[PDB]
Amino acid sequence: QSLIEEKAESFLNKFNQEAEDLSYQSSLASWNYNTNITEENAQKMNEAAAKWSAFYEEQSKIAQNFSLQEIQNATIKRQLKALQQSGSSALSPDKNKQLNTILNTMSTIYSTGKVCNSMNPQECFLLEPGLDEIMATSTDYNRRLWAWEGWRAEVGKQLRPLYEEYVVLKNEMARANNYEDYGDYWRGDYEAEGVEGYNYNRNQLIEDVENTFKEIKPLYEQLHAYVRTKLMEVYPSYISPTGCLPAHLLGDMWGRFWTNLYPLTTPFLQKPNIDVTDAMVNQSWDAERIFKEAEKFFVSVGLPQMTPGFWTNSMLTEPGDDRKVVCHPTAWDLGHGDFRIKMCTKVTMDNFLTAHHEMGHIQYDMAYAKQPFLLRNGANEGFHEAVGEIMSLSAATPKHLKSIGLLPSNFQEDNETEINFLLKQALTIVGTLPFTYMLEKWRWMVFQDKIPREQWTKKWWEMKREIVGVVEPLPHDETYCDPASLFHVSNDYSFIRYYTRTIYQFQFQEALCQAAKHDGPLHKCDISNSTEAGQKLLNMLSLGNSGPWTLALENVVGSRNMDVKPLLNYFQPLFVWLKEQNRNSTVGWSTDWSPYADQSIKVRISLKAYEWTDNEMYLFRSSVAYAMREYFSREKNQTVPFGEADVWVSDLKPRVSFNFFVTSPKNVSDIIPRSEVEEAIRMSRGRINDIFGLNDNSLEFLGI
Amino acid sequence: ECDFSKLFKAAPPQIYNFSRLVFTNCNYNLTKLLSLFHVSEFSCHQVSPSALASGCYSSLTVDYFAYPLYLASYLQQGSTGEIAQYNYKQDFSNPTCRILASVPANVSIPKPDKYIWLSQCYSFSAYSGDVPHYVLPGQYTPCLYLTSSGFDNSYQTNRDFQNKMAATGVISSMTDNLQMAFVISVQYNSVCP
Numbered sequence: 103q104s105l106i107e108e109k110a111e112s113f114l115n116k117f118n119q120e121a122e123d124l125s126y127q128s129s130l131a132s133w134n135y136n137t138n139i140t141e142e143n144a145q146k147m148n149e150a151a152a153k154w155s156a157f158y159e160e161q162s163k164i165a166q167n168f169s170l171q172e173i174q175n176a177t178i179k180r181q182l183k184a185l186q187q188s189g190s191s192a193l194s195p196d197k198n199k200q201l202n203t204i205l206n207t208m209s210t211i212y213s214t215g216k217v218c219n220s221m222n223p224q225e226c227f228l229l230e231p232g233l234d235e236i237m238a239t240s241t242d243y244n245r246r247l248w249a250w251e252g253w254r255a256e257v258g259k260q261l262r263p264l265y266e267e268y269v270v271l272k273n274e275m276a277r278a279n280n281y282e283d284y285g286d287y288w289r290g291d292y293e294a295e296g297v298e299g300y301n302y303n304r305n306q307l308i309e310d311v312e313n314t315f316k317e318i319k320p321l322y323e324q325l326h327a328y329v330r331t332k333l334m335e336v337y338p339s340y341i342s343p344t345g346c347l348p349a350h351l352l353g354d355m356w357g358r359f360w361t362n363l364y365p366l367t368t369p370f371l372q373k374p375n376i377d378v379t380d381a382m383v384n385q386s387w388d389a390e391r392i393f394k395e396a397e398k399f400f401v402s403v404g405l406p407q408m409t410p411g412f413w414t415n416s417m418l419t420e421p422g423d424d425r426k427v428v429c430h431p432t433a434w435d436l437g438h439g440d441f442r443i444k445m446c447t448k449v450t451m452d453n454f455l456t457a458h459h460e461m462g463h464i465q466y467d468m469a470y471a472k473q474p475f476l477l478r479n480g481a482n483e484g485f486h487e488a489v490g491e492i493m494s495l496s497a498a499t500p501k502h503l504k505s506i507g508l509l510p511s512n513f514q515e516d517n518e519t520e521i522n523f524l525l526k527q528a529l530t531i532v533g534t535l536p537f538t539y540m541l542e543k544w545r546w547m548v549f550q551d552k553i554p555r556e557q558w559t560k561k562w563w564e565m566k567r568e569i570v571g572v573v574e575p576l577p578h579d580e581t582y583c584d585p586a587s588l589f590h591v592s593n594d595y596s597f598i599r600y601y602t603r604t605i606y607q608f609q610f611q612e613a614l615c616q617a618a619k620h621d622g623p624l625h626k627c628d629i630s631n632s633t634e635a636g637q638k639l640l641n642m643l644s645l646g647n648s649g650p651w652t653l654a655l656e657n658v659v660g661s662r663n664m665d666v667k668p669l670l671n672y673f674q675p676l677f678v679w680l681k682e683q684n685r686n687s688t689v690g691w692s693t694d695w696s697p698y699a700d701q702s703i704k705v706r707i708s709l710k711a712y713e714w715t716d717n718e719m720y721l722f723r724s725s726v727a728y729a730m731r732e733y734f735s736r737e738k739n740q741t742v743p744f745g746e747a748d749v750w751v752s753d754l755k756p757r758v759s760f761n762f763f764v765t766s767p768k769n770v771s772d773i774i775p776r777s778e779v780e781e782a783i784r785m786s787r788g789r790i791n792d793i794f795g796l797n798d799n800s801l802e803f804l805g806i
Numbered sequence: 807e808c809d810f811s812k813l814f815k816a817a818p819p820q821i822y823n824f825s826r827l828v829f830t831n832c833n834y835n836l837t838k839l840l841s842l843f844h845v846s847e848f849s850c851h852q853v854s855p856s857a858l859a860s861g862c863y864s865s866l867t868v869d870y871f872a873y874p875l876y877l878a879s880y881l882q883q884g885s886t887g888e889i890a891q892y893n894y895k896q897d898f899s900n901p902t903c904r905i906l907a908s909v910p911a912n913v914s915i916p917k918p919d920k921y922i923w924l925s926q927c928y929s930f931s932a933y934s935g936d937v938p939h940y941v942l943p944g945q946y947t948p949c950l951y952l953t954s955s956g957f958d959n960s961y962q963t964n965r966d967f968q969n970k971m972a973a974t975g976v977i978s979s980m981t982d983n984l985q986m987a988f989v990i991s992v993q994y995n996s997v998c999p
């Protein structure tokens with residue numbers, strides 16, 4: 103043993119035992135507050151967290167004395183590397199405080215911004231609750247557009263200046279930790295080293311994500327073409343049969359998930375899905391019974407049972423006392439073998455599946471509890487959720503439900519219900535993949551300076567049309583920040599974990615169903631009573647992150663790379679059905695059609711000569727607003743206060759050419775007819791020429 | 807006759823430090839011994855409860871400790887929880903039976919302040935992690951010397967850095983009636999009713 107190796111091992115022994123005691127007290131204080139929300143409990147939580155954070159910072163500096171090049175043991179070296187990560191501490195105290203001010207301002211704007219009705223300024227809405235209820239259930243085109251544009255106009259424009267300074271500060275922090283940029287720093291979770299044949303480079307992630315998305319695209323286009331056909335029934339006027347989908351009609355504020363579109367896209371209306379909620383009520387189930395069934399499922403595959411302290415310390419039901427709690431299902435790993443679950447459990451089918459998902463997190467924690475303290479994690483950031491998903495997949499199958507008595511013994515499954523079930527799965531799983539891939543691609547290019555600030559908004563909607571097949575209902579300039587209107591962007595969270603978790607979960611399920619000798623389509627598989635499948639899963643769970651994530655992946659699936667073929671196998675019955683439903687339709691989209699292109703007027707200007715700057719564009723909109731006021735006052739005998747914000751400009755070329763259209767004040771859904779705008783331009787044609795000093799040849803309105 | 811006075815003299819120990827009595831060449835009365843308690847479970851193995859009272863054996867062994875009744879499922883044969891792993895492993899190589907009971911206030915048995923059992927016992931090292939120590943059938947845990955200080959709160963860990971050992975204890979509140987567990991094993995004859 104090397105002398106440096108001996109000194110480092112002695113240092114890590116004292117740290118590991120001290121950190122367990124301090125981290126456990128911090129978790130226990132947090133648990134007491136979450137199940138008992140008082141001012142006194144909040145004070146205790148803050149004090150315990152500060153003590154644990156102070157200890158960690160002091161020990162991190164002591165770890166800087168060890169040279170990782172001299173350490174030969176990979177386990178000791180991996181612990182020291184984790185303890186040497188400075189993070190935000192690399193910045194000077196002046197800039198660290200500046201970044202914290204920006205981060206807190208963006209989080210406060212997001213959670214407290216309000217959009218208000220134009221007719222009644224006194225009636226305002228928050229994002230949650232409020233606009234989220236509208237965007238989930240409304241089928242009113244005009245009302246959905248009001249909430250979509252109002253959120254980005256009122257809140258997104260406040261975040262635009264703050265996000266520009268946030269990018270500069272994050273790149274300065276990343277370079278101080280020897281990274282290319284902040285996006286490169288975020289991709290370090292997937293870095294693997296130390297074993298020959300299992301190395302994974304940071305730059306490999308970008309190429310591998312693009313390669314996997316290419317094989318997903320043919321399936322996503324069939325789902326896109328099917329949803330477009332159904333939405334033409336709901337919105338006959340507003341949908342092009344060959345173009346993109348309007349962004350405000352996707353069942354979500356950002357269209358991250360298409361789950362809420364299911365009532366409008368049901369393949370078979372007279373074949374409802376399997377809802378065992380009524381059977382649980384008729385058999386007098388309770389919350390404790392639900393978690394006992396989940397425990398039986400894990401024992402049948404060979405996993406250990408819950409500890410005695412799990413049943414006494416958990417909060418499985420909503421308290422009936424004067425105690426106020428947070429009702430969000432979470433699994434807690436306090437330390438020292440203390441495992442708890444906090445859940446406000448109802449007797450419903452949805453809560454039955456959530457109990458299996460949360461106890462899967464507990465099983466993962468229990469498996470790697472024997473690892474050193476700093477190595478008690480998942481293999482990478484996408485492993486933990488992938489384990490939780492596959493448990494819910496097996497518990498929801500009709501074969502599993504018949505074996506636990508929630509379905510009759512003579513229950514028969516028809517293939518029309520199977521298509522209903524698979525279509526609902528694709529609206530959540532397949533639909534979110536292009537959204538996740540496109541968003542993280544945009545942020546990566548922003549951190550690399552591939553996209554300048556002057557083109558942030560422009561590149562966002564070019565990639566929406568190209569990759570996602572989604573078109574914006576109103577044009578946006580560089581005063582907007584549409585990415586930042588999402589929670590994960592304005593709250594400084596990486597997003598690629600949702601893309602990789604989806605791929606991992608179907609690789610895991612296909613491997614475990616093969617170990618269970620399942621014969622049939624992959625979506626009908628149940629791994630219950632299979633101790634061979636539980637042995638492969640346990641070989642991966644107990645590793646933690648003490649080795650390369652590629653080696654842990656190969657223990658369960660037998661390969662070291664991401665693969666989307668198991669995902670394509672899971673949705674094969676739906677893929678065959680979709681190609682028959684889209685036989686007479688168009689598959690694919692064109693990126694030129696837009697909801698506002700039919701009422702736009704083309705403007706061509708040849709100055710050569712003053713530069714056509716942003717100030718000259720502001721003057722043009724005011725001149726158009728002036729012409730609209732005069733036309734309404736003279737030809738229609740109406741007084742309408744048209745302003746420069748009622749003029750919408752799109753497709754601005756480096757040469758002087760663009761399009762514009764006019765909307766009515768207070769109403770972004772009321773577009774003025776193009777014929778009436780032409781009459782307005784014709785009436786004041788002479789004065790517009792005098793404003794810009796350009797005759798009919800230098801400045802021309804096409805179509806007039 | 808076999809004397810059970812040492813049972814009633816002092817408080818029963820905890821499960822990881824169970825007391826053992828061995829009887830040879832004496833007359834025993836199991837009916838009188840168990841008549842003093844409210845028996846809640848009499849699960850027997852390789853013998854009948856009626857045949858165990860009136861048999862003749864060469865040796866008789868009794869293991870007893872304080873045990874809360876709501877943890878009864880964790881003492882059953884084939885369990886893989888922490889009770890069997892680190893505290894007490896029953897030896898089924900001979901006919902043995904397990905009795906759970908409550909002590910009425912009429913019986914004069916001092917009772918402890920609380921119930922304590924170990925949740926884990928292991929050796930630690932930064933090179934590889936934690937190596938658990940599992941209790942053998944009929945034998946004591948190697949982490950016994952680390953419980954002498956006691957446990958003040960649940961999930962407290964008592965360490966010894968010289969030999970790199972750690973033990974964690976879990977506490978349950980003392981009940982109104984002291985609850986105990988008896989494990990009786992026999993071998994085949996000088997001990998008869």
Ligand SMILES: *[C@@H]1O[C@H](CO)[C@@H](O[C@@H]2O[C@H](CO)[C@@H](O)[C@H](O)[C@H]2NC(C)=O)[C@H](O)[C@H]1NC(C)=O
Pocket residue numbers: 138140142143425
């Ligand atoms: C919820 O929190 C309150 C407030 O901390 C707890 O009330 C405390 O109870 C202890 C005894 O358990 C008293 O000594 C404290 O003085 C109480 N605090 C206050 C501020 O009055 C309450 O026990 C907690 N409830 C549960 C179920 O744990």
Ligand SMILES: *[C@@H]1O[C@H](CO)[C@@H](O[C@@H]2O[C@H](CO)[C@@H](O)[C@H](O)[C@H]2NC(C)=O)[C@H](O)[C@H]1NC(C)=O
Pocket residue numbers: 402501502505506628630631
């Ligand atoms: C796993 O196997 C067990 C048996 O080991 C199955 O439970 C049995 O179910 C049958 C009906 O199919 C009952 O007649 C038996 O009494 C049950 N046995 C026990 C011990 O409960 C269980 O259904 C299987 N789980 C699956 C298929 O998910």
Ligand SMILES: *[C@@H]1O[C@H](CO)[C@@H](O[C@@H]2O[C@H](CO)[C@@H](O)[C@H](O)[C@H]2NC(C)=O)[C@H](O)[C@H]1NC(C)=O
Pocket residue numbers: 517518521679
């Ligand atoms: C469900 O299965 C039925 C048969 O049980 C399918 O009905 C057949 O459909 C094919 C074309 O796909 C026809 O050639 C056959 O004549 C049909 N058979 C009958 C008896 O009508 C049905 O298409 C399947 N449905 C789905 C959604 O998969």
Ligand SMILES: *[C@@H]1O[C@H](CO)[C@@H](O[C@@H]2O[C@H](CO)[C@@H](O)[C@H](O)[C@H]2NC(C)=O)[C@H](O)[C@H]1NC(C)=O
Pocket residue numbers: 819823950951953954
């Ligand atoms: C385990 O229990 C034994 C029971 O004999 C303890 O030993 C006795 O401890 C008492 C404490 O009041 C002393 O009065 C006796 O003299 C001890 N007897 C013997 C033979 O040593 C023992 O201390 C317990 N061990 C632990 C670690 O708690």
Ligand SMILES: *[C@@H]1O[C@H](CO)[C@@H](O)[C@H](O)[C@H]1NC(C)=O
Pocket residue numbers: 167
């Ligand atoms: C370790 O840090 C100490 C305290 O800052 C310093 O005195 C010493 O030179 C350092 N040694 C090495 C090997 O870096």
Ligand SMILES: *[C@@H]1O[C@H](CO)[C@@H](O)[C@H](O)[C@H]1NC(C)=O
Pocket residue numbers: 175176177933934
């Ligand atoms: C580190 O050393 C320990 C103790 O000899 C050994 O068991 C372990 O395999 C070593 N780790 C690696 C990664 O080689």
Ligand SMILES: *[C@@H]1O[C@H](CO)[C@@H](O)[C@H](O)[C@H]1NC(C)=O
Pocket residue numbers: 220221244768769771772773
């Ligand atoms: C906006 O115009 C539409 C028709 O284009 C009209 O139905 C609606 O009432 C208007 N909005 C408001 C808030 O008045």
Ligand SMILES: *[C@@H]1O[C@H](CO)[C@@H](O)[C@H](O)[C@H]1NC(C)=O
Pocket residue numbers: 835837838999
């Ligand atoms: C055992 O004790 C009981 C107490 O009721 C008594 O009736 C019985 O006769 C005793 N048996 C012997 C063999 O002493």
Ligand SMILES: *[C@@H]1O[C@H](CO)[C@@H](O)[C@H](O)[C@H]1NC(C)=O
Pocket residue numbers: 912
């Ligand atoms: C025995 O217990 C019973 C029931 O509580 C009680 O009435 C009786 O007085 C007790 N006898 C003695 C001697 O303590």
Ligand SMILES: [Zn+2]
Pocket residue numbers: 459463486487490
């Ligand atoms: Zn989860």
